Design a protein around this ligand. Sequence first.
Ligand SMILES: CN(CCS)C(=O)c1ccccc1
Ligand SMILES: CN(CCS)C(=O)c1ccccc1
Ligand SMILES: [Cl-]
Ligand SMILES: [Cl-]
Ligand SMILES: [Mg+2]
Ligand SMILES: [Mg+2]
Ligand SMILES: [Mg+2]
Ligand SMILES: [Mg+2]
Ligand SMILES: [Mg+2]
Ligand SMILES: [Mg+2]
Lengths: 235, 235, 7, 7
Amino acid sequence: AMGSMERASLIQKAKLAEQAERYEDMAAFMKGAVEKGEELSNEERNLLSVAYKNVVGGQRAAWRVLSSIEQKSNEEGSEEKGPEVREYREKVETELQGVCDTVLGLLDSHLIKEAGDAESRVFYLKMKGDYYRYLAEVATGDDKKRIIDSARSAYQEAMDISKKEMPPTNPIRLGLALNFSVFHYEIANSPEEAISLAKTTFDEAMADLHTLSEDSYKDSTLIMQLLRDNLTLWT
Amino acid sequence: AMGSMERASLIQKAKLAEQAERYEDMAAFMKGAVEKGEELSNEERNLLSVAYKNVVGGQRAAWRVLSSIEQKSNEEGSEEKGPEVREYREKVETELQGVCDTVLGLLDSHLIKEAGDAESRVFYLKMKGDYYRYLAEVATGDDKKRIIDSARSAYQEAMDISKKEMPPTNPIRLGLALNFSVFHYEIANSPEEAISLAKTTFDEAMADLHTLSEDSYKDSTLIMQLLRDNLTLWT
Amino acid sequence: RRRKSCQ
Amino acid sequence: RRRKSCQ
Ligand SMILES: CN(CCS)C(=O)c1ccccc1
Ligand SMILES: CN(CCS)C(=O)c1ccccc1
Ligand SMILES: [Cl-]
Ligand SMILES: [Cl-]
Ligand SMILES: [Mg+2]
Ligand SMILES: [Mg+2]
Ligand SMILES: [Mg+2]
Ligand SMILES: [Mg+2]
Ligand SMILES: [Mg+2]
Ligand SMILES: [Mg+2]
């Protein structure tokens, strides 16, 4: 639907949509920009991520509300209210899966294969792990283990690159470690791995802060605090 | 699209959508329920109003953000950035107008004509004034005066009924007066009428509070405080 | 401070 | 308190 709009206009409108908190529009504009076939700059990758994280975040929050109602509906002593709660949870779930499949499709056609620099490749592989993680959050069937393994594999490739090619304070590296640690805790039933990863990431970043400017220090310490927040919650 | 779903299931799902903060879904479910052709109960009217107020409220907020950017873009000394800001403001505006036209269409086919009790009739005529008011907020052309007059006329009919048939503390009557006062202030360039209406509404409600239960007192005083907030802002 | 309408 | 991920 965005094929007739200039790439630069799509990027401009994505930024306007962000200012207006119109994240569905923002995501549609950024999808259009990706489909122009050119690589994304750092700023453009961030716009893509912000847009879809906000869209799926709303869907995930709604899914959790509905899933909890459905759970309570199926306890002993609860009254049969019909198929409606399940139907509506399924509707939201299918829409969420559709957004995840769209993002994964953009990554596969063809953002990842053209991404050669560590900053872009790690960013996109992190995103791939994230959207498989969101699929795993709602999965229950024959392919659930395979969805979890797809998330794990993308995160692991991103980790391997990030450790070789980025400093331990790099914000992308830090955010990847944060999210892979959440994957371990919440998805893979591996709380010890989650804690170990968060701790080693935090400690290795702390030791590298001395190399940074004031502005980079602020960026890195912000994400380190998210790691610390999880460690405090989990221990 | 909701023609195959039971009325009761649409109402149930509207309530689930509210809990999940999925207001677009909530509005679609309530539109489906209205289109079943039966009158709405008090609770169902409130669900319809909540759903569409939240949808259009998001659109209005986005329109104001974009309109302000467009304004700044057209000041002296600003740099030509192309048609994109105007285009995107127009896109949001058209979507907003579409929602208003949908609500007005439900009211006209056939909620108002079947509404005989004061509580339903005043409620729907207030809604008609509100959605014409939202159309007036974005109007600039040959029909703008006619849109403003349509809002005025609906509000005035609702006021006439409410004064004859409802006590001065009735929450629907109070909310109608609040919104008609905003219409006067913001739309009709009549700040004195807006202030006079808010003041007389507040004072007449205050004199009737003695008749109310604790719970009704809480309901009425909440809306009276909104009138007071506007009077404090405007004087 | 934005004026109030009936929400 | 909900755990943090990268927002
Ligand atoms: C509390 N409250 C909303 C603020 S006025 C109402 O009672 C109401 C009145 C008219 C229409 C819809 C809602
Ligand atoms: C601050 N912040 C988000 C919290 S980790 C980032 O810098 C980022 C890192 C990776 C991917 C997207 C954003
Ligand atoms: Cl449904
Ligand atoms: Cl547009
Ligand atoms: Mg399903
Ligand atoms: Mg390349
Ligand atoms: Mg490097
Ligand atoms: Mg227009
Ligand atoms: Mg009737
Ligand atoms: Mg009466």
